Design a protein around this nucleic acid. Structure first.
Ligand SMILES: [Mg+2]
Ligand SMILES: [Mg+2]
Ligand SMILES: [Mg+2]
Length: 342
DNA sequence: CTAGGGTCCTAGGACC
DNA sequence: GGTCCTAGGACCCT
């Protein structure tokens, strides 16, 4: 009853597209991200920049101190969406069991596939080669019997490589696998788990489910299961977007409501244009706003509302501005919408 | 020196 | 007791 799951993951996705499209960037350290003046962060970087320590989510000021010659690009999201569409169409040549997780990655269930004599190893290889040939971008893959292991596997032998975990191999693999490598166990949880002597899945196997449940809720069950290779989540392929949001961090904190309102007036046409691509009538389930203060606390207020409406978004921003700003400056304003259910 | 795009879980009170 | 409404926050991707 063993399934074959493939995880495919593009290498340095945004950066790889910039190099393909401008070969002058191939061998110098580059990065997509907001500028230091914009108070931005690094979205991604190429391997010459990562050599210096540059990583995704790093403040750009830190990126520039580690790598003073970093060339900073603003990002061409239509070019990335284009490549993303193409790889998903390449996935569809092999199976309809495709669950994308972001622009540049997807799960595939090829258990019932007849390509490559049913070899999931050979299918992943054909997909990576077919992605290089037609997009001039490279990809890595992971093959495993369950989702999370296949996704860990695709990280292990990148760039432009893959890694296979057979059922016979998973107990040795799990025994020293750091918990933090499981998708969904993040920095906070890893630090909690560390602080009680739990670092690897091997550690968690020595733990009682009842204890983990009390101490972590449903998260504890997930921990207990993943630590034994248990991950029965199906590859979906029918998932749908539930919300759309637009927000901007200003280069300077704002302190006056006129400033906040001026910002909303520019965010709103962008939110409308994007909602309209998916919902021409703008019919929604909820709409709302987001403020991030200078103590980095963040608040949102959203409410039931039937149709994208700009003045209600301003009025809600007004209450939030008065009722819970407490004289702090504000570094970010955001608009938000929750999509109807079907 | 801290983005912007998202998903999902938790939790309390309202409402049934 | 279910389900909805709302807020917050961990986490994912680049
Ligand atoms: Mg990637
Ligand atoms: Mg990815
Ligand atoms: Mg990444």
């Amino acid at each position: 009853g063993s399934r074959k799951i493939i995880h495919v993951d593009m290498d340095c996705f945004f950066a790889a597209v910039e190099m393909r499209d401008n070969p002058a960037l191939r061998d110098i350290p580059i990065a997509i991200g907001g500028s230091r003046e914009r108070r931005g962060v690094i979205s991604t970087a190429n391997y010459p920049a990562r050599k210096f320590g540059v990583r995704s989510a790093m403040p750009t000021g830190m990126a520039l101190k580690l790598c003073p010659h970093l060339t900073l690009l603003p990002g061409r999201f239509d070019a990335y969406k284009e490549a993303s569409n193409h790889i998903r169409e390449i996935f569809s040549r092999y199976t309809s069991r495709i669950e994308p997780l972001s622009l540049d990655e997807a799960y595939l269930d090829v258990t019932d596939s007849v390509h490559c004599h049913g070899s999931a190893t050979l299918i992943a290889q054909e997909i990576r080669q077919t992605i290089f040939n037609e997009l001039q971008l490279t990809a890595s893959a992971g093959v495993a019997p369950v989702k999370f292991l296949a996704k860990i596997a695709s990280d292990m032998n990148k760039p432009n490589g893959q890694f296979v975990i057979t059922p016979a191999e998973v107990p040795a693999f799990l025994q020293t696998l750091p918990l933090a490598k499981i998708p969904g166990v993040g920095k906070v949880s890893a630090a909690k788990l560390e602080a009680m002597g739990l670092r690897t899945c091997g550690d968690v196997q020595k733990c009682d489910l009842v204890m983990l449940l009390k101490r972590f809720g449903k998260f504890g069950r997930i921990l207990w299961e993943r630590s034994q290779g248990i991950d029965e989540r199906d590859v979906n392929s029918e998932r749908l977007r539930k919300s759309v949001g637009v927000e901007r961090t200003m280069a300077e904190d704002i302190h006056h409501w006129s400033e906040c309102e001026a910002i909303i007036e520019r965010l709103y046409p962008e939110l409308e244009r994007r909602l309209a691509k998916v919902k021409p009538d703008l019919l929604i389930a909820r709409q709302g706003v987001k403020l991030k203060f200078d103590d980095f606390q963040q608040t949102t207020q959203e409410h039931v509302w039937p149709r994208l409406n700009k003045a209600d978004l301003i009025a809600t921003a007004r209450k939030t501005w008065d009722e819970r700003r407490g004289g702090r400056g504000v570094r970010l304003v955001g608009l938000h919408v929750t999509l109807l259910d079907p």
